[PDB]
């Protein structure tokens, strides 16, 4: 039993809801919140911009030190950093950005990072400003992630579309 509330059960381990991931994280304080990161951990917009704003820019400060030490992530890769006031940990995961021309096949590799964590609050990877079809992202999520994933979808119209088309 965990503290997530109001989710629709899509599969054995995947749950989906219309929610602002920032507000969901602040309320649930999950062990792991997933950020829709880029390879530079520059949290300017989209989900990353919103998560970073909620930490009063502390996520960005921590991230800049991480990059200065380690260099950029790989597309499809991840790193674990602090969750600040939102979660115990933040798993920064880089899905391919379609508005950059990156290979959508890397979306499966990106979701594989979720399997290192028993329970996660997460957005759909590569959705939104990353340019991929959120329906496809959901399919890859369900077919790749084996741990318990709670997907927060900000847009109510998109949430409704995501449920009604799910196979
Ligand atoms: C960067 C990013 C990611 Cl990676 C994931 C999500 S989401 O999982 O909340 N889905 N939402 C959408 O695709 C969307 C599309 C068109 C208009 C509004 C939308 O909200 C949002 C964002 Cl901005």
From Swiss-Prot:
The chain holds residues 1025 to 1191 of 7096 of the full protein. Residues 1-167 form the Macro domain. Responsible for the cleavages located at the N-terminus of the replicase polyprotein. Participates together with nsp4 in the assembly of virally-induced cytoplasmic double-membrane vesicles necessary for viral replication. Antagonizes innate immune induction of type I interferon by blocking the phosphorylation, dimerization and subsequent nuclear translocation of host IRF3. Also prevents host NF-kappa-B signaling. In addition, PL-PRO possesses a deubiquitinating/deISGylating activity and processes both 'Lys-48'- and 'Lys-63'-linked polyubiquitin chains from cellular substrates. It is found in: Host endoplasmic reticulum membrane. It is a multi-pass membrane protein. Inhibited in vitro by GRL-0617. It catalyses: Thiol-dependent hydrolysis of ester, thioester, amide, peptide and isopeptide bonds formed by the C-terminal Gly of ubiquitin (a 76-residue protein attached to proteins as an intracellular targeting signal). May form homohexamers. Interacts with N protein. Changing residue 31 to A: In strain: Mu/B.1.621. This is Papain-like protease nsp3.
